[PDB]
Amino acid sequence: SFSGYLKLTDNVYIKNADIVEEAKKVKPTVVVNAANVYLKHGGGVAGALNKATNNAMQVESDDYIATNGPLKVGGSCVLSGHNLAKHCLHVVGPNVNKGEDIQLLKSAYENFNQHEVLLAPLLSAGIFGADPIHSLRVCVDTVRTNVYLAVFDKNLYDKLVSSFL
Ligand SMILES: NCc1cncc(Br)c1
DSSP states (O other): OOOSOEEOSSSEEEEEOOHHHHHHHHOOSEEEEEEOTTOOOOSHHHHHHHHHTTTHHHHHHHHHHHHHOOOOTTOEEEEEOTTTOSEEEEEEOOOGGGTOOTTHHHHHHHGGGGSSEEEEOOTTOGGGOSOHHHHHHHHHHHOOSEEEEEEOOHHHHHHHHHHOO
């Protein structure tokens, strides 16, 4: 199971780790992808997760979009986890660099409550442009299920832990 995590609350845990490496080791029931509405896994966590699946996540995602159309910002869909997890929960957090409503970050984290345990990144953090300290606060105040957060950047992980109220 999950190891080396620091407990933040009753249900939120955090570790300085590469989420792809964490997914390969653990093979969680659910790995969360930091998706966009088009499921175009080009960069950040999405590009890294997709590259780990040898592009199978993108092929599956393109078929999903061809059938269903784009997701909503704040929404999600459950697809295969391929070689990383049983399932991948593709969650769309608001992209601040695209002028999207930061208030949608709470709606995005609410998707986690449909799963008892998840391996996840901080939503809207990184290339999505939101403040990761704000994302962690929304996570602990929204998610009630067991969430194991993987933060790739060591310096950011340290900042998040040392500033956690
Ligand atoms: N080394 C794979 C990787 C690349 N980029 C971001 C993350 Br998170 C992980």
